[PDB]
Write a protein that binds this ligand. Structure first.
Ligand SMILES: *[C@@H]1O[C@H](CO)[C@@H](O[C@@H]2O[C@H](CO)[C@@H](O[C@@H]3O[C@H](CO[C@H]4O[C@H](CO)[C@@H](O)[C@H](O)[C@@H]4O)[C@@H](O)[C@H](O[C@H]4O[C@H](CO)[C@@H](O)[C@H](O)[C@@H]4O)[C@@H]3O)[C@H](O)[C@H]2NC(C)=O)[C@H](O)[C@H]1NC(C)=O
Ligand SMILES: *[C@@H]1O[C@H](CO[C@@H]2O[C@@H](C)[C@@H](O)[C@@H](O)[C@@H]2O)[C@@H](O[C@@H]2O[C@H](CO)[C@@H](O)[C@H](O)[C@H]2NC(C)=O)[C@H](O)[C@H]1NC(C)=O
Ligand SMILES: *[C@@H]1O[C@H](CO)[C@@H](O)[C@H](O)[C@H]1NC(C)=O
Ligand SMILES: *[C@@H]1O[C@H](CO)[C@@H](O)[C@H](O)[C@H]1NC(C)=O
Ligand SMILES: *[C@@H]1O[C@H](CO)[C@@H](O)[C@H](O)[C@H]1NC(C)=O
Ligand SMILES: *[C@@H]1O[C@H](CO)[C@@H](O)[C@H](O)[C@H]1NC(C)=O
Ligand SMILES: [Ca+2]
Ligand SMILES: [Zn+2]
Ligand SMILES: [Zn+2]
Length: 804
């Protein structure tokens, strides 16, 4: 009965375009309105031909007319369906010289959806089982659609590429940006180099079916091919016009490609991440992918196209019952608020009062007002440096960190409170996205640990054989995903060798202001800072077992070898750049004895009388004298070469870290290697800066005040092994970048009892080793017997606590 499905006029079930009568009749037509409303073709049609109006083609002249249905070749003609096919085990056609790349984004697909519902998404599940997949992939803060999409194709942080939020205001442009229409396509907003222009400049074709910015002329050009954004466009028709692109002639066949759909972001927003509707949209999404996988099969490139499946962010459940209102903290709410899970506060009157608007008073009124607020206010410079959310004029100073599942909004007329949303901290589980990968150059049946999304850009360029523009990702750290890693990482060279800080006598007279009444033979006690070549060797491998930090910053430093610690002292800051010591489990001891170091030139040292009374700053100890056995050993730490100016309120947390927290971490982890130092970042760019940049000092001195203090903790993931005998691959790292502040208002405790606020506080301030390097100009883990791409894996890693 074939003539002519949903037809007029010409047994039963061929008629009619009803013109309903009680019987149309059913049988042969229902499997028909299909070719027009479905992207799949059935049996009852297999071998049929074109029809006047259709979506997908089944059949019969279609394999070479370049139009038929992804499942046609298996559900019409019968060959192994991709889905029903094993994971084995082989290249592109010849009209395909180099391996193509498809970047497929399912907006709002959180990592948890995958682990929990994998069985409900057969095609994504097959793909994960046999592709190369990550446990989760992190987003950048704030977790919004454009921030993270454009981040994904530029390899850059929000603050560098400039799309720092859905809605933003730039005072220098005096302009507004909204995803809700024009002018968002104004190129003035978009910094950097999207992947599609990286392909265009270096000679490749890039086609985008929808990506944030694809419709925008960044730097004066578009993606070779792009699409005006329409959300009503059926997903399947995207997959079809995407597959059509690779049927194109090899000269205009696009090499790079993007695919994007709005689910399960839409349904996650309406009904929340744990809902039946969300599961439905996940199936929808898995179908959208299955088709693509099939058109990969229909053609012969399924094992050739490299495909990245990911999302920009996760989804978190919200409620009208969990909202913070600025009316609770402001008798007068008079200011502009960007509302949500990632709020900001600025002036209503812009440009004029943009800078004048007092962001610190606004933070100070939002601070410690109710015993348990569900958010925290920060000046951007005071945000955790892991977020890299500071250096942009668009990033307003006032920022709120909202607890997960909660929202911070202006008034009580707030309405979008139900369902789910995103924008929270990229450390929250609910915000993690998926990463899956299938293709040559990607291992099969491999899972990898979590990595950040700022890596993906390099990866794409490495797959496309390109040279990526400067970005925040660390090239080579993803080579564990790659059969043939395109780019081999090169150790950065030390640009500042060590200088010598030699031995000398006790000055006469000693004007340092130092006093230590307990030492009996002084030149003897000082003789312990002058090690013989093999005491120095033992200490050199016991306290710097992973190698000495290379110094890439131009600095004047020198190496101070002691038995229990080692440090590089820089005459530029009058303190050590870095300090390393190992504590081995196991393991009341502070300053009452203090003296100058005979190895430091006086003019280049801090003095005991530099820290005069009438101060909010005391000398803190980089190597804790807490950790050495009395007596002669403790003297080795009680020198002015081991001190850093610390705000007393910071010293509070720091001392609690030596005295209680560090011993516990050490015995919990079977000892630790500790390398700590200061950070000066007064331009809040996340880098080290010229020493002319430091804007604060110890009063009536030239002693620089560090903006942060960093601590890198190193041990073995095998608690059976110590930091010293741990094989490099299994090394465990917990890094800290602690804000150096005059008060603890951030813990909302300028009060007792040091207990549980310190650990929480540090917990939100962890960082990658890479973050510390960039802030200090230091290179770590130089002497590790390991492919360096592995060592890059260890340094992109960010420790996250379960609230622990
Ligand atoms: C994430 O990744 C990006 C890419 O690496 C980094 O962004 C770069 O940051 C560096 C240093 O902050 C920038 O280098 C600087 O370039 C300035 C000129 O750049 C021109 O072109 C850029 C294009 O983006 C324009 O934005 C800009 O307006 C300029 O027209 C120089 O003027 C700077 O020189 C300073 O040099 C030294 C200090 O080292 C001093 O001697 C000088 O006096 C002078 O002050 C500097 O070289 C670079 O431009 C940025 N690139 C981009 C694309 O923005 C981020 O740093 C990185 N993030 C982190 C935290 O690592
Ligand atoms: C550095 O000192 C300033 C100012 O010190 C004040 O004036 C001096 C001449 C001397 O008389 C000191 O005893 C005074 O304290 C400090 O700025 C003050 O900080 C305090 C508390 O932090 C605050 O109450 C004052 O308003 C500030 N300004 C003053 C005192 O007028 C500053 O805190 C000191 N910084 C360090 C690192 O010690
Ligand atoms: C054929 O498609 C038209 C819409 O173009 C629809 O109105 C009609 O119901 C369809 N015919 C049948 C019987 O499926
Ligand atoms: C930015 O948008 C809001 C309008 O909702 C407004 O407060 C502000 O004045 C706008 N900026 C300008 C100057 O257009
Ligand atoms: C912008 O394009 C120019 C050439 O048109 C190129 O030299 C430059 O590298 C591009 N800049 C970015 C950020 O892509
Ligand atoms: C969006 O796509 C739908 C589906 O084809 C179409 O009907 C509609 O005209 C499109 N809207 C715009 C604004 O182009
Ligand atoms: Ca800096
Ligand atoms: Zn999104
Ligand atoms: Zn969304």
């Amino acid at each position: 009965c074939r003539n002519r499905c949903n037809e007029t006029f010409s047994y039963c079930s061929c008629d009619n375009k009803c013109t309903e009568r009680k019987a149309c009749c059913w049988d042969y037509q229902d499997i028909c309105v299909l070719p027009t409303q479905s992207w799949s073709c059935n049996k009852l049609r297999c071998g049929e031909k074109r029809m006047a109006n259709v979506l997908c083609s089944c059949s019969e002249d279609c394999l070479t007319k370049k139009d038929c249905c992804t499942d046609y070749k298996s559900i019409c003609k019968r060959e192994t369906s991709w889905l029903k096919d094993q994971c084995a085990s082989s290249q592109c056609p010849e009209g395909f010289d180099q391996s193509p790349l498809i970047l497929f984004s399912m907006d709002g697909f959180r990592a948890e959806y995958l682990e929990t519902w994998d069985t409900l998404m057969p095609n994504i599940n097959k793909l994960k089982t046999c592709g190369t997949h990550a446990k989760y992939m992190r987003a950048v803060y704030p977790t919004k659609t454009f921030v993270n999409h454009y981040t994904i194709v530029t390899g850059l942080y929000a603050e560098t590429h400039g799309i720092i939020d859905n809605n933003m205001y730039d005072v220098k442009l005096n302009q507004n940006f909204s995803l809700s229409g024009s002018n968002m396509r104004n190129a003035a907003w978009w910094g950097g180099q999207p992947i599609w222009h990286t392909a265009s400049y270096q000679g490749l074709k890039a086609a985008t079916y929808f990506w944030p910015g694809s419709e925008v002329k960044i730097n004066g050009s578009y993606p070779t091919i792009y699409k005006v954004y329409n959300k009503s466009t059926p997903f399947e028709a995207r997959v079809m016009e995407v597959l059509k692109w690779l049927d194109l002639p090899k000269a205009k066949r696009p090499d790079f490609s993007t695919l994007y759909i709005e689910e399960p972001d839409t349904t996650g927003h309406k009904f929340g991440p744990v809902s039946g509707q969300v599961i439905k949209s996940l199936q929808m999404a898995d179908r959208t992918l299955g088709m693509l996988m099939e058109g990969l099969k229909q053609r012969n490139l399924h094992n050739c196209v490299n495909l990245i499946l990911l999302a920009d962010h996760g989804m978190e459940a919200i409620s009208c019952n969990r909202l913070e209102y600025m009316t609770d903290y402001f008798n007068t709410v008079d200011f502009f608020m960007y509302e949500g899970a990632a709020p900001r506060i600025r002036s209503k009157n812009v440009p004029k009062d943009f800078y004048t608007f007092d962001s610190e008073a606004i933070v100070k009124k939002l601070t410690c007002r109710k015993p348990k607020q569900h958010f925290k206010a920060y000046l951007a410079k005071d945000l955790p440096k892991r977020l890299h959310f500071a250096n942009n004029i668009r990033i307003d100073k006032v920022n709120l960190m909202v607890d997960r599942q909660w929202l911070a909004v202006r008034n009580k007329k707030y309405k979008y409170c139900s369902g789910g949303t995103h924008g929270y901290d990229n450390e929250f589980k609910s915000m993690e996205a998926i990463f899956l990968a299938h293709g040559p150059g990607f291992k099969e049946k491999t899972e990898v640990t979590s990595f950040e999304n700022i890596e993906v850009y390099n990866l794409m360029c490495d797959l496309l054989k390109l040279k990526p523009a400067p970005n925040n990702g660390t090239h080579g750290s993803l080579n564990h995903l790659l059969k043939n890693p395109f780019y081999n990482p090169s150790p950065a060279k030390e640009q500042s060798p060590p200088l010598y800080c030699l031995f000398g006598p006790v000055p006469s007279p000693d004007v340092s202001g130092c006093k230590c009444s307990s030492i009996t033979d002084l030149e003897a006690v000082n003789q312990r800072l002058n090690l013989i070549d093999q005491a120095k060797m033992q200490s050199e491998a016991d306290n710097l077992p992973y190698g000495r930090p290379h110094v890439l910053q131009h600095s004047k430093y020198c190496l101070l070898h002691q038995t229990k610690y080692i440090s590089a002292y820089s005459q530029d800051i009058l303190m050590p750049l870095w300090n390393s010591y190992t504590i081995s489990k196991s393991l009341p001891s502070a300053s009452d004895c203090l003296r100058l170091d005979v190895r430091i030139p006086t003019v280049q040292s801090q003095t005991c009388s530099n820290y005069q009374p009438d101060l909010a700053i005391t000398p803190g100890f980089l190597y804790p004298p807490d950790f050495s056995s009395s007596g002669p050993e403790q003297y080795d730490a009680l020198i002015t070469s081991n001190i850093v100016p610390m705000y007393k309120e910071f010293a509070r947390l720091w001392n609690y870290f030596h005295s209680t927290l560090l011993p516990k971490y050490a015995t919990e982890r079977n000892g630790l290697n500790v390398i700590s130092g200061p950070i000066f970042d007064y331009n809040y760019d996340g880098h080290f800066d010229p020493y002319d940049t430091i804007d604060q000092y110890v009063n009536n001195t030239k002693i620089p005040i560090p903006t942060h203090y960093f601590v890198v903790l190193t041990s073995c993931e095998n608690s059976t092994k110590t930091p010293l005998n741990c094989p490099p691959g299994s090394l465990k790292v917990l890094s800290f970048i602690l804000p150096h502040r005059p008060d603890n208002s951030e813990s909302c405790a300028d009060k007792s009892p040091d207990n549980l606020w310190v650990e929480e506080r540090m917990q939100t301030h962890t960082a990658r080793v890479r973050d510390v390097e960039l802030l200090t100009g230091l290179d770590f883990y130089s002497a590790l017997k390991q492919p360096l791409s592995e060592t890059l894996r260890l340094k992109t890693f960010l420790p996250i606590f379960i609230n622990s």
